[PDB]
Symmetry: D2
Subunit: 457 residues, 4 copies
């Protein structure tokens, strides 16, 4: 027995039991009973033993407009671990004019031997060449079973209905799942330019230039297209009442529509973009921050089991280095905010306030995502046979989130100042302790790529 975790309360999505764990060769081999001798023994007394967090929506390392993101695959995964997240599914981005394979290879270069935690890939298709699209017949067998496309971001990521339909079609044939950023780009452009023309350049206009309708329409269209092709689809970052409604309408018609939300959409509002002295720039992410009523809508949807997970959509644009190129034009502000580390703690506060149950926390934060994106049961819960990806949670620990205490390469936190109750203490990745009582103690060589399974839905 390599490791034994005793005196803790094992909390899975469908179980709560005070028992001891036996880890052997990166896997959980025994729960309860006589465990025997063990190299190391961890005392989880007064703590929860949760499955490791699984963030299926990250942009760990990116290059936007010749400039690079503050975080790298190494700096982000370390923060992820310190935040209780042991698996991540980053968005492998294709380069215009290049192949998907060229993209995967590029990603391997960034991840290989540098990820503190395990990782899988989603493939972004932003240059739908006949050959590129034909590659979707190949990537699945490499363990990349989810294709992602954008309906916004003209001349950068945006593709059209013809493309989406072709992607939906290839996904059905290869048993893959299409993911989509649903915003009507043209509608946004129209408003963005109209605002700038009127001399309106503050961060707030990032939100006003792309109101709920922009998201709602695109969402509905994508779902409609999925219905036509008769394919499963996954709507990333559903952020407001109107777009959620379309997802709901699609589900009732029988469309295999799936959706998710992201931490910040349960806590931030467009008013945050009005914080003085360009601080609002920090909250310039897409879709735009909504309103508090949307927070209730989303939390209720969570409690009712509507969403598949609460991911982070983690980005790293230095407030100083990157957000800066926009102090005079919100359009130039690189979109995105950090949160891969804070995800669990923030979502967990919902169990503290009765918004969501303790058991649902695990479902949303790890088990359900794992199921959808083909990593269950190897990843996701805590059962015999599971990789020993574990988080020892202290439900009573109180703390204020400060970027100075975070573990990535950013110059600010989206949750700076938030008081939380319930903190990740020590983390295990396939049996190895990578975070011990708050200190990262792993190797950038620990993380491994995950060939994810097909037929998602």
């Amino acid at each position: 027995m390599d490791i034994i975790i005793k005196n803790g309360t094992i909390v899975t999505a469908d179980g709560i039991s005070r028992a001891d764990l036996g880890i052997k060769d990166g896997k959980i081999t025994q729960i309860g009973g006589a465990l025997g001798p063990a190299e190391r023994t961890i005392d989880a007394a007064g703590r929860y033993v949760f499955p490791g967090g699984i963030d299926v929506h990250t942009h760990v390392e990116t290059v936007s407009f010749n400039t690079q993101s503050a975080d790298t695959f190494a700096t982000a995964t370390v923060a992820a671990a310190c935040g209780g997240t042991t698996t991540i599914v980053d968005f492998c981005q294709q380069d215009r004019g290049h192949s998907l394979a060229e993209a995967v290879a590029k990603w391997d270069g960034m991840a290989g031997g540098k990820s503190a935690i395990d990782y899988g890939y989603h493939i972004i298709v932003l240059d739908p060449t006949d050959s590129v699209i034909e590659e979707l017949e190949v990537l699945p067998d490499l363990g990349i079973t989810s294709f992602k496309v954008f309906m916004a971001y003209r001349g950068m990521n945006m593709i059209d209905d013809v493309t989406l339909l072709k992607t939906l079609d290839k996904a059905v044939k290869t048993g893959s799942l299409v993911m989509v950023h649903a915003e009507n780009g043209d509608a946004a452009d129209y408003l963005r330019d109209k605002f700038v023309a009127e001399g309106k350049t503050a961060p707030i206009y990032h939100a006003l230039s792309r109101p709920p309708r922009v998201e709602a329409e695109a969402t509905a269209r994508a779902l409609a297209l999925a219905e036509i092709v008769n394919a499963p689809i996954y709507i990333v970052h559903v952020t407001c009442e109107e777009s959620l409604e379309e997802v709901m309408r699609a589900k009732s018609r029988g469309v295999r529509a799936l959706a998710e939300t992201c931490t910040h959409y349960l806590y931030l509002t467009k008013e945050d973009l009005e914080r003085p002295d360009f601080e609002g720039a920090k909250y310039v992410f897409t879709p735009p921050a909504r309103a508090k009523k949307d927070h209730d809508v989303l939390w209720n949807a969570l409690r009712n089991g509507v969403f598949e997970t609460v991911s982070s959509d983690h980005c790293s644009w230095l407030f100083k280095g990157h957000k800066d190129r926009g102090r005079n034009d919100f359009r130039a502000i690189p979109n995105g905010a950090p949160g891969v580390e804070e995800r669990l703690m923030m979502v967990y506060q919902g169990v503290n306030e009765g918004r969501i149950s303790l058991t649902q926390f695990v479902e949303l934060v790890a088990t359900r995502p794992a199921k959808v994106f083909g990593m269950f049961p190897q990843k996701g819960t805590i059962a015999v046979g599971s990789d020993a990806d574990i988080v020892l949670w202290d439900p009573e620990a109180e703390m204020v989130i400060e970027q100075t205490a975070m573990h990535n390469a950013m110059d600010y936190s989206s949750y700076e100042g938030h008081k939380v109750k319930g903190v990740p203490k020590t983390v295990l990745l396939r049996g190895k302790v990578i975070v011990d009582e708050g200190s990262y103690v792993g190797e950038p060589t620990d993380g491994k790529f995950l060939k994810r399974r097909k037929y998602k839905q």
Copy 2:
């Protein structure tokens, strides 16, 4: 170690692992690892090890219009066990003019020392006396934390909005959950009488006399009342697209609305009431059987995680002895159909047809119900600390459901003739084997009452 289950695949709502189990003193004490010696060892090779079924909607023993139901607490619980269900929550029915306590005592008389499996009680309030309503302040502490009322059945079970509001109010104060049969009784009566007046007396008119609108309206009203009192509510047997829609609308408004469906609403249709030679009488249950499009609607809702469970609403009215008093007036036909035994197999067929996942099967059939009605984690899953309520499922076993092979006191099955794949083989109740390879081998003294926990939602 009293018992060891080896070579099986443990399937909980959030886990799938090939491991062995160790049962000691009615509880699961160890999973995986070195188990040691054991009184008995069961070979679950090639079989699933599921948590025991939990049916929160049964009418095991009833007396309707001076006549008694074919099944008793003893005959039903035995059938339940043979069907893979180890816990049941029967509806303890108050008698007009009598107290709730008088009712519970009466139920204990029927269950005590006679239940093959464990059981809890829901309390039906059909005579809202000032004192009776004041009793709702007491029952909770006895372990009866769910109050049930009827919106239909004039001069028998029907109560009014004033009552429902008082019940919703008492439930909020005692941390209980109000359950409701939602049909507009008056609307039904109007149509029932109108049909009989026109000389229409066949079974089909049972359905036509209470169409979807009758259910939908009542559902909406109940949810509206729950919204006003600001209390959680549970809608029993949601059977069609229109009523489900109201539940959905309520959920979006923020109403803590919960709902469920029942096996037969996923398989039977009003056309079944047209089967020749009074056979349709067998399908006279309430609300009425709907249409196939409603089956898709419900299954989709299940797959999307809308419902809390799929219960049975088990009743026992002999086709000959009881249904008979209605061969000339559908109104005289006692409402209800049997299914406590077939529940799991029938719901399981949904995993066979991709309608629902293997993991969701357990969620719906046992884990989610247990959670809602305060029996989790003692009951519900398979974890260390759980009562050893287990079902060893043979996913390959094929069989035709025939009443001659069922184990209750009825003269017919609602699923007579259905071919199924996946059958319950041996069942354990808190460690004791009560069903061995298909043969009931327990004692009517095995079942125990369960003091269920409060604050349901």
Copy 3:
């Protein structure tokens, strides 16, 4: 030619033409062309020639809780005339324990020889006796073709679904139209009492004790019942987004559902009940005043042609004499507000603000109501054969509405202080000038009863 109206612009719901009118024997006999000599000639230069207003929702003379209303059939009809309204359909109220006929006779006593303008009756059924209900087979032939019931006001007006269904059924047989006040009375009572118990007695609680859900639910139920009986139904005073939504859903299902709104629901808000020094008592009407967003919803619905009319629901409870019995308990405040006189001017302001068209003003204010309640084309528009019920409107006239300038017996106006553009100047009732340049010059003997036509929808 008794009268000739020249130089005016005739504005009907479907026509705008500068032409002269020829009135002979209470009717419009010629439009345009050579008119010839005439007893009197009116110069409508620079003015609109609108059909006379038709208010199908008035409570001109009432007795609530032993006390009588400030206005009588005489004082109200005079105000109506001065406001441009020439026809009215008052709610003839049955007395508990008495017949409908007894009620009509009582009404005739109040109206006969005392109405300044023409009038018809709606019959309120608040004591559904077998005989009473059987009377609905008679009233229609007397010219009373619309039955009204209440879903709220316990022990005063409230009837049940059984009653409503019986009424809906009688209406279908006699070709009548059922009207309904849709609020869940029990839900309201629950909240009303709960508030008082907590010591909350200010006027505001009149609104909070009966929020939108209370109205919405009842509305839906009534429409559902209408659907079951398969009968046309008319929802009086739809006041908010949620209840309107139910009307809309009913219409889509094919239910012959009709609805209306009332002047004050386009201008007042629940915040008005918070006006200091018990002033809010003036705004205590039912359903409660909503919010501004509901004003937009309603106006949009009007512009889209959803509603059949904008009536007033005119009541007369002296702010001093009557509202007073409630300075310590909002529940004791008699419900209702005045507006029969201000109706047209207030609705007309909507054409000034582009909310509604000039042509729709007439449709809503007179032509559509006349059509629905069987008085078209005798009443309603301006065509050859129409009764000469006319209003000469000055679109440029500006004025502030002050009760001191109104013409009824009330001590306040619901629109006190409102600045308006467009005032009624001279009014004709079947050819007779009853209001001349702002001065009432008619006789309480001018008004006549109207036997209204059947089959409304």
Copy 4:
């Protein structure tokens, strides 16, 4: 007095009166009273005197894929007159690479001195050049105040959201109304090609290749874009429950959304495309024929006043000459069906079956369209000052619609075989009798262009 119409019943949208008419110099100068001498007198005894029909959706003369339509501006307008329609608003189609002016001039060439009845133009923008779009600032002042764009028909008519937004924007500035053919072209193409690839080429696939969702999505998107620009929009040919629903949702949000339907969408179904021997080709129009349930939905919507009119979308593709190029590929079948002549009779049958009222018939068939497209009150009703555009209707006349009896250049009728009650007998265009007791007796020089008014909504 040039003409006098006596003994008839004048039926306008808001009036029904037995009176005589006096026409002088193309206008109605007097109604009722002493008319005097007249060049000609028409006896409308036992007949209705309706305002002339107004069809705002025609394609009288078209050129699709090098081939020309069977009907010309002359042959169509004659049929229109014989059908009771006196005004038409044809879709002036721009040619790729050419200006809008070039298009108008081309249209004048076709209409000038050749139209049997009056006509206006809608301008189709299918080549959104910077200059072309700038022309929208000019056309309005020429009397062309409605811009039409297509969301389907790739490489032929289809424009994008960027275009639509620019058009919506220009319309708001020039006080014009944007009209749109709402179908997701790409979605359709995907299905069209998929079907052909599978060897499915029969006419039925024209419908299946573009199901309700295709229409619904586009409809919603257009309305969403209109909402963003905050402009009024008009959805042409709403054909089913799902697309109508989007219009309805838009209206509730406050979007100034208008919509219409077309005769054939109230009578034909996709099953018609299955008629044997390529007959189904006759029913190949777009959007595709729906189902009977959609007929009820639409008729109910009509009765509730949802739509602005029931136009025809008149096209002329010879069953033999044109439909033929598709006996082996439904895609090659030119889309469109004839109906400008049958429109009124067909819609009128709805009043016969209680689906719609007699008064609504006129509203939909003439008065409401005239209002929306800025031709009211010159055109639309029957009032003093109106152009004398009249139809003398015989409500008792029965007849079977046969193409051999129609008056255009087509080889078939979409309503061949339909038995109707109520036929147009004699028609007047601005005072001149152009159809006398069923015989066309006008001159192709009678019709004149109409400079329509701005700000439509």
